[PDB]
């Protein structure tokens, strides 16, 4: 189905030395029987659990097709390149755990459209740029870790970010704001 | 002197024209008098005249060498798997003695030369895996002796031409995987009397299948798959006397499977899956000694005819996603080397046929979302061929056969949402290839066998909604490839041990609605990939381990237990509001807690 | 995509 095709596309662009994705048979009608993939009672993907898999490579925009996805766990890997903007199309997403990877480039502004997100852990990456203000519009956000990145600019202090401590934004290139020592220009 | 040739000079000119990085034309020595012993060069005639040149897979790059046409007696040219580039020259017609031209898997681009039809001797044209574009030239209707036309995996953007039906000599029409303008199957294609193969997969075909196609007595393969064809399967197709394979899958075809397909004695393979076909599967088709019958994802109804069991050649039956009713043929698998059975998401009822694995070849048994009743046939205990068993969402009852647990090549065993009773046998230890075990929502009883720990490659154990009991086997903690353990809704008792540390690859632990007692091991935090923990509905006692703070958990429930003390401060947040309810001893900075 | 002519082996 569409969901299986999207996950297969991810498999093709990922480097998988331990063959953790060997169960990912595209000829199966649904990806639900695949290991590391969990489906709901309507057989739609709700969880992808691929942390500490020694996975290398790049993510694909086609992850955005998984509308009912709630947990995306791709942490403790060497996945490189940008965080796809289409991850913003994952409306039902509750967890985005891309931490302990080599992701580079900006944090997409699209991630603000994740209305139900409770966890955003993008820590221990090489992400650059400013923290999108859209993330303040995520009312459900309870855990944020953008630490150990190369991010720069103003740190938002409003909405969800109102509650966030300095530990979330630690060890970044040039973060200015109230949470940081350095006040903004 | 009239029989003297310059063939060596001509081939040396060909060598100069093309780039040869990997030096595949080093044998081509200018000093050599005759080119006949050169690599890829065959002179089959009395004189020193080249008759065949095969330069396949030589990493040769450059435009087509039109000088080669000066080889007067060249009848066979293959440049397969090379980097020939640019347009195919119209001067190729000068190769007037060519019977075979293979320019497949090259980088040739542009419109097809019309002058190809001006080669009278041509029997075989393969231009597959090139970037040819535009309309198929009208000259192609005037081919005199061509038997094979392959234009597969090119970039042709035209309508499928009706004049191609005018090549009487044609035995194979291969136009697959081309970006054609949406086109109807020319009815004039019915006039290709000698045609053995019609391969038009992914040709953007629209409209009805023409009744004319039934006149192709000599046809062996009809592939009209992965197109947008509409209408009924023509009843005239019973006239394909010599047909072996019919592929009509993933079209928009409607209507009933014609009973006239029973007249096709040589037919072994039918796939009309992912269509809107309605009505019953005809008995007359099922009477044919078929090898593969795939009619999956249609709107077909009624009983599967018993005649299908008679076939001695049947290895594949995929009829899933239909409204088919009644029982599976009693003799199914008895007379045939059955390998793949998929009757899933149908309304089938009754006992499973007794001897499905009679010939010892059954790999995949998929019957999910049917109303099948009774016990697992004991024969299946000796079906070591099986790799995938999906018997889930049926009305099955009774103990699982002892051997069925220990089948060596099984990767997935799904018995979920049945009324299966009894225990997991010690024979499970022999299930070397078992990765996923799903036994959820059954009436299974007893302790989990110690031999379940012998299955190191087990990745999932899901046994929710069962009557399983006793302490967890110590061996269970030896499973370090285990990613999901869901034992919720059982009667499991006893304590968790420090051995849970070995579950280094466990993402989910659900031990909820059990009778587990004791303290949550401090080693819970050593589980690197644990993101989901439910120990709710148990009698777990003591202080919540400080180790739990080390875990990044997207789901936590320690509710309705005997846990006591103060929450580790990390867990005192509003997100963990419903995680610790029903633990009386437990007090933290949460508005319901104490 | 370019599979040789024959059935589609989709399975559950
Ligand atoms: C035009 O299209 C037709 C149909 O699409 C196509 O015809 C067929 O040709 C193929 C390719 O040669 C045939 O394929 C095989 O079947 C034969 C049995 O007759 C097998 O022996 C082959 O088998 C295997 O083992 C080999 C090693 O020993 C392997 O290298 C190989 O990969 C196989 O595993 C092979 O499977 C096919 O049988 C016919 N089918 C019909 C219906 O005629 C034709 O080739 C196309 N021509 C052009 C020029 O495009
Ligand atoms: C553990 O269970 C797994 C669950 O299916 C088994 O998996 C599959 O294993 C089979 C056989 O190893 C494999 O088959 C095919 O795909 C291959 C990959 O391209 C392909 O090369 C194969 O082709 C050929 O081999 C077959 C073997 O019968 C011959 O008949 C053919 O003529 C040809 O030479 C073949 O198409 C599956 O791909 C694979 N699927 C998955 C999803 O992993 C394991 O085999 C099994 N192991 C044990 C020891 O029990
Ligand atoms: C948290 O604080 C930020 C910073 O002030 C708030 O900001 C911003 O949101 C408004 C949207 O209401 C953006 O502006 C709008 O301006 C455009 C013209 O560009 C106008 O056409 C719209 O009608 C609208 O008035 C503004 O650019 C944006 N600021 C930044 C830096 O991106 C944010 O709304 C606060 N959080 C909330 C409300 O949750
Ligand atoms: C294409 O073929 C049709 C069908 O023709 C006949 O049946 C074939 C199986 C074979 O036996 C042919 O030799 C037969 O002629 C052709 O059709 C008919 O045309 C004839 C005159 O040639 C006419 O008297 C008949 O009544 C027609 N019958 C039918 C059923 O159509 C048609 O002419 C051929 N077209 C081309 C472009 O060659
Ligand atoms: C159908 O094939 C025949 C030959 O098999 C083609 O016949 C020719 O007709 C043209 C004029 O129409 C003559 O100039 C040629 O000399 C004929 N050639 C032969 C070999 O007889 C006929 O043109 C073809 N029709 C189509 C549409 O391709
Ligand atoms: C079955 O056919 C459909 C189309 O009839 C295939 O689907 C589409 O897939 C293409 C190429 O991947 C997409 O660009 C289109 O957007 C899709 N179209 C529609 C209408 O959905 C589908 O992949 C085929 N499936 C199988 C299993 O063969
Ligand atoms: C699979 O089995 C479960 C358990 O027997 C079915 O579940 C429940 O559904 C009924 C009626 O809808 C409820 O009254 C129960 O409270 C549910 N119990 C549990 C444990 O979930 C489920 O509907 C079955 N699914 C199918 C497709 O048959
Ligand atoms: C066809 O391929 C050949 C070789 O890849 C191309 O050849 C030439 O142009 C190159 C770029 O300037 C040079 O580096 C080569 O030495 C030269 N080789 C020759 C002429 O044999 C050629 O231009 C290609 N043509 C097209 C249309 O793709
Ligand atoms: C991640 O991959 C890149 C290779 O492009 C490499 O430079 C980097 O050191 C890798 N880190 C690992 C394997 O720890
Ligand atoms: C994160 O990165 C810092 C350096 O940026 C390093 O000291 C720390 O060990 C890393 N944390 C994890 C969880 O790997
Ligand atoms: C824990 O389980 C109880 C019932 O078993 C439920 O009411 C509560 O919402 C659950 N809490 C969480 C965090 O899932
Ligand atoms: O050479 C045997 C070969 O014949 C042809 C087809 O029926 C194939 O399936 C088979 O393998
Ligand atoms: Na799964
Ligand atoms: Na002709
Ligand atoms: Na289609």
Author numbering:
A (entry chain BBB): 27 to 211
B (entry chain AAA): 13 to 606
C (entry chain CCC): 109 to 120
Quote the authors verbatim:
Here we demonstrate that HSL1 binds IDA/IDL peptides with high, and CLE peptides with lower affinity, respectively. Ligand sensing capability and receptor activation of HSL1 require a SERK co-receptor kinase. Crystal structures with IDA/IDLs or with CLE9 reveal that HSL1-SERK1 complex recognizes the entire IDA/IDL signaling peptide, while only parts of CLE9 are bound to the receptor. Our work reveals that HSL1 is a receptor for IDA/IDL signaling peptides.
